[PDB]
Amino acid sequence: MQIFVKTLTGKTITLEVEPSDTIENVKAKIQDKEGIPPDQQRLIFAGKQLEDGRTLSDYNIQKESTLHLVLRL
Numbered sequence: 001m002q003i004f005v006k007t008l009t010g011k012t013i014t015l016e017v018e019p020s021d022t023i024e025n026v027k028a029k030i031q032d033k034e035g036i037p038p039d040q041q042r043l044i045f046a047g048k049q050l051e052d053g054r055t056l057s058d059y060n061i062q063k064e065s066t067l068h069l070v071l072r073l
Contacts, residue, residue: 003056004066005030005043013069019057023050026067036071044068 005013005026015029027038043050045059045067061067 001063003061003064005069006066007069008071017056019061020055022053022055024052026056027052030069040071040073042070042072044070 001017001019003015003017003026005015007013013030013033015026015033017026017029023043024038026043027041030036030041031038038052045061045065048059050059050067056065
């Protein structure tokens with residue numbers, strides 16, 4: 001499956017995931033792709049700040065969803 005990650009700056013990432021992927025694992029693939037440590041990553045979907053230990057499936061994040069990545073310090 002393909003999901004997307006859209007940033008405050010407009011740039012788009014695309015990630016291959018599974019519904020059983022944890023939000024933390026999405027942050028790991030982002031770090032594998034962009035070098036951004038996972039602690040600097042907040043993911044949001046439908047206004048819900050997604051917690052690291054739940055899965056996409058837990059949030060009904062399905063094929064071709066577009067999450068929202070807000071970096072932090």
